[PDB]
Amino acid sequence: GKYFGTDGVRGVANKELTPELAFKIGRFGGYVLTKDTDRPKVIIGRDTRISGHMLEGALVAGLLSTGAEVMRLGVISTPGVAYLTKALDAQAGVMISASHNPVQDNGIKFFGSDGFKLTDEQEAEIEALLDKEVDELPRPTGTNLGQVSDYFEGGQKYLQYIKQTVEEDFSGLHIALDCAHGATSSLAPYLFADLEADISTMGTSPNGMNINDGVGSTHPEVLAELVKEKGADIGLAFDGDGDRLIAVDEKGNIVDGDQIMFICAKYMKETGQLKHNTVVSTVMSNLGFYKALEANGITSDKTAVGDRYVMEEMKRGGYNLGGEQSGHIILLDYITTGDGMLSALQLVNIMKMTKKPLSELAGEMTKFPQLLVNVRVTDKKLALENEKIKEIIRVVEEEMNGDGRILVRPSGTEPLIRVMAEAPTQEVCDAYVHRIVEVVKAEVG
Amino acid sequence: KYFGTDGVRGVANKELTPELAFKIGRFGGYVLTKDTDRPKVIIGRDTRISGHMLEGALVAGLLSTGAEVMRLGVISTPGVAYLTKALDAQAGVMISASHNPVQDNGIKFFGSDGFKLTDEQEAEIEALLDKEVDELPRPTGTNLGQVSDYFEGGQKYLQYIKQTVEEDFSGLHIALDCAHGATSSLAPYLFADLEADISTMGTSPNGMNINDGVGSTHPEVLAELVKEKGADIGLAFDGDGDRLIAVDEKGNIVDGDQIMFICAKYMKETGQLKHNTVVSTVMSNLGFYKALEANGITSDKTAVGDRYVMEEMKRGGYNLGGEQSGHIILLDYITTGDGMLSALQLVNIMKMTKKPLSELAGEMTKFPQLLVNVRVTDKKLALENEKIKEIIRVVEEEMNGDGRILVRPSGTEPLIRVMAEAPTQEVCDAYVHRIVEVVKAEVG
Numbered sequence A: 001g002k003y004f005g006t007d008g009v010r011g012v013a014n015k016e017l018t019p020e021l022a023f024k025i026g027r028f029g030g031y032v033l034t035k036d037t038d039r040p041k042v043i044i045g046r047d048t049r050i051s052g053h054m055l056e057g058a059l060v061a062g063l064l065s066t067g068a069e070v071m072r073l074g075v076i077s078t079p080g081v082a083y084l085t086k087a088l089d090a091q092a093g094v095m096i097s098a099s100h101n102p103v104q105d106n107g108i109k110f111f112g113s114d115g116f117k118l119t120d121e122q123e124a125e126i127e128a129l130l131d132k133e134v135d136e137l138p139r140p141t142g143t144n145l146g147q148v149s150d151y152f153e154g155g156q157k158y159l160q161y162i163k164q165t166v167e168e169d170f171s172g173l174h175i176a177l178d179c180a181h182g183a184t185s186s187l188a189p190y191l192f193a194d195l196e197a198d199i200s201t202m203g204t205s206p207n208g209m210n211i212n213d214g215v216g217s218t219h220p221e222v223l224a225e226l227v228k229e230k231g232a233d234i235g236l237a238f239d240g241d242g243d244r245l246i247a248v249d250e251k252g253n254i255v256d257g258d259q260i261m262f263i264c265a266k267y268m269k270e271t272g273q274l275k276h277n278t279v280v281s282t283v284m285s286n287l288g289f290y291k292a293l294e295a296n297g298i299t300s301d302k303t304a305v306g307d308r309y310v311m312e313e314m315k316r317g318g319y320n321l322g323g324e325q326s327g328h329i330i331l332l333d334y335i336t337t338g339d340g341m342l343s344a345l346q347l348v349n350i351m352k353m354t355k356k357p358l359s360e361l362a363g364e365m366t367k368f369p370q371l372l373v374n375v376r377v378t379d380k381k382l383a384l385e386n387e388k389i390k391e392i393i394r395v396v397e398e399e400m401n402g403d404g405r406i407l408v409r410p411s412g413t414e415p416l417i418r419v420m421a422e423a424p425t426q427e428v429c430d431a432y433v434h435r436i437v438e439v440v441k442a443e444v445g
Numbered sequence B: 001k002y003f004g005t006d007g008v009r010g011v012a013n014k015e016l017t018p019e020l021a022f023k024i025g026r027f028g029g030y031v032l033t034k035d036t037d038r039p040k041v042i043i044g045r046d047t048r049i050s051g052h053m054l055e056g057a058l059v060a061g062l063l064s065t066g067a068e069v070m071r072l073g074v075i076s077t078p079g080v081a082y083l084t085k086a087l088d089a090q091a092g093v094m095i096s097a098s099h100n101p102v103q104d105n106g107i108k109f110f111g112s113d114g115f116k117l118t119d120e121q122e123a124e125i126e127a128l129l130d131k132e133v134d135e136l137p138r139p140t141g142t143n144l145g146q147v148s149d150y151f152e153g154g155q156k157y158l159q160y161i162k163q164t165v166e167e168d169f170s171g172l173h174i175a176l177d178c179a180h181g182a183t184s185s186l187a188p189y190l191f192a193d194l195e196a197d198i199s200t201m202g203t204s205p206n207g208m209n210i211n212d213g214v215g216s217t218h219p220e221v222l223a224e225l226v227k228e229k230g231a232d233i234g235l236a237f238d239g240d241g242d243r244l245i246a247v248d249e250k251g252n253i254v255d256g257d258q259i260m261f262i263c264a265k266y267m268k269e270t271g272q273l274k275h276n277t278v279v280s281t282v283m284s285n286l287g288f289y290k291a292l293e294a295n296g297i298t299s300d301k302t303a304v305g306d307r308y309v310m311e312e313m314k315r316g317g318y319n320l321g322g323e324q325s326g327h328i329i330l331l332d333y334i335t336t337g338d339g340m341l342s343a344l345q346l347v348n349i350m351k352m353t354k355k356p357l358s359e360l361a362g363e364m365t366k367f368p369q370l371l372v373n374v375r376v377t378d379k380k381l382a383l384e385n386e387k388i389k390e391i392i393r394v395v396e397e398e399m400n401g402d403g404r405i406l407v408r409p410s411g412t413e414p415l416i417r418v419m420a421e422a423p424t425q426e427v428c429d430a431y432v433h434r435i436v437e438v439v440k441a442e443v444g
Helices: A019-034 A052-064 A078-087 A120-129 A153-163 A187-194 A221-230 A257-270 A287-295 A307-317 A340-354 A358-362 A387-399 A426-444 B018-033 B050-063 B077-086 B119-130 B153-162 B186-193 B220-228 B256-269 B286-293 B306-316 B339-353 B357-361 B379-383 B386-399 B425-442
Strands: A009-012 A041-046 A069-075 A092-096 A105-112 A148-150 A174-178 A198-202 A234-238 A245-249 A278-282 A299-303 A321-323 A329-331 A370-375 A405-409 A417-422 B008-011 B040-045 B068-074 B091-095 B104-110 B147-149 B173-177 B197-201 B233-237 B244-247 B277-281 B298-302 B369-375 B404-409 B415-421
Touching (some): A019 A041, A019 A092, A019 A105, A019 B050, A041 A052, A052 A092, A052 A105, A052 B018, A078 A092, A078 A153, A078 A340, A153 A340, A174 A187, A187 A198, A198 A221, A221 A234, A234 A340, A245 A358, A257 A340, A257 A358, A307 A321, A340 A358, A417 A426, B018 B050, B018 B091, B018 B119, B050 B068, B050 B091, B050 B104, B068 B077, B068 B153, B077 B091, B153 B186, B173 B220, B256 B277, B256 B286, B256 B339, B286 B298, B298 B306, B379 B386, B415 B425
Parallel strands (some): A041 A069, A041 A092, A278 A299, A278 A321, B173 B233
Antiparallel strands (some): A092 A105, A405 A417, B008 B104, B091 B104, B369 B415, B404 B415
């Protein structure tokens, strides 16, 4: 086992992600990141999870033990930590959370001083520290010990900063929010009220036990019920830690991350704000999003699946907008990580500046009929080389022109191979899948 | 091993690691939690910088057993003990190393009854502290402990200790030295609220400055303050307010022996000093004992340490005990040494008798005594040694009659304690520094 997965260390709080481990991540983490600074400084925030406090105590203790200064942020979104760590001139910032996962889980994610994820080489150096039998690092003593303090102003500094990315205010709109009972439970209702909108809220009553429970971006249907009943203009579903956004138009339909990105780029190009007129998405987003995006002279920059990819691509390209189907969207001009509340602001601003309803804005692309089945392989590298699968693809590839896409490929996350088809008809694309899936199943299942 | 005789002490982050502290939090928590439902532990600290790191680890540890935790912030140790009896928690923890310099911190526990844990409880935490892997329960999800703040706890403590006095303190001018420690905000409110004139020093903890040039083991700057601002009394507390040492109006130090007497005599005068005995360690000076005898007060003497005094008081139902150091116990009110409490009681006599401190202290006479503490690296080796052991021999059979000696390891600090009392300060000091230079030279 390595410890840092695709986005920090996750695991069940007190059973895999133990206080013991959390401390060590703090100490090795602090030491790695603190190393080459006189006056080292780390900020730390979290979502509303029960285990939040147990892990924050360990992480603070571990940080302090290296000599670093800690600033406690309280409950804040993960983008908030990102923003603040760059803006405060901290060396690193830590966010305790497992995002949309259920309460038992937690996680620890670091941003370094430029507001980005740690370099591989730094993460690596941490992991090797977690590997040694004995801790033989510095033990600063007496008056060389780390100092801690509260920086609860942070959240609102953050708030003021995103708030002012808006044109005029939101008056005349009714906006419903679902804050997943997580990090945005108090921030997002504040922010939208400050912006003069009428609000109805749900999932804004965290108690420690209830984060993401039948609420939030991955269960937006209850919000969609609220939107219809409260007769609202838009619903906004953030996840546990406020990096994803999923919307609901005024008719009750879910408007996903593709639709959101599409609305943003359309309006950004029209306003001359979309750098080099391109949008970055993983290869995993819908074909209709691609064709829509081109119908408006907007060039598409597609990456491997992961958001590290979308992000690295934005950085190198000098791009400006990118993200995934899931509502993780990056407005790199402002925040250095995806931000649900930030992207929700930009969304509501477009409804406002164009005086058009969400169903309309969203309906200016048309998503293709999709179908995705993950099948449980038994080592991908062989199936990736498996002649019968490789040709079952070739056969459906030959069938469509088109006028269709097939996408089959695993990861390292869950071990499984992900067959996915898109065609103008549901029937066809169900049919290519059921096919490609029979072959995989019989050959590797 | 880990458990000294008064918590677990060490220099923060070198011997008292946050790792160790986490364990003490979890294992202790567990041992103290097992036999209750909805379990609850409170936790307070002095002003040492390392207090926060250690709190972080302790709270982690406690939360991980499922216990609920209430954070007190900076508060004196007797306060931790008062509240853990009062708020009906199963334990109170205090993070402090008393009068020690900054590097040092310590962790002391209090039980449901506000007393220090049974040797049986202490032994079992110890016995878990040794175990190979921990197979203690790890509650997950919604069984995890919640934390919250109880930062009014201090005021509740102050309310209590307040009413233990006969009348207000008006027309008295009181100087305080709070050792830049746990009493910093507590003490000044407390006395001010009893309508007294207040001057302060050592009330600006920056986290680095506890006991440093201030507080009860360094009362002189205070002594000057009292004289400078024409005070009626000076009161120096220690880092965590378990000690008091005072200054009379003329600027003379009034130590623990002198306080115990001033209180002892008055308690006796007012028929409220149990069995007319005072418990002390065998460290108090002749003049102390001799002024307790004149006055028909029975002196009861233990071996050295707070543990031994409390036990004695506990067993014989006595209600006033303490040490020369100013660690004084008024059992009727509070379940541990309490500096500020002693203060109130003392200031109380002054006010009730209409007497100034010099004449209260002056009732008893200090005989010549010196205790010098050598800063050493192995108590063990130290005492059983060739260049030290013998000197002691030669001196002893010289005072006869007619003087005395007590040389011994500490139990909680890295020092040896050398003490003599004799018929003159001159011989007394000579007896000691003779040994000292030697310890100083032999054992680092």
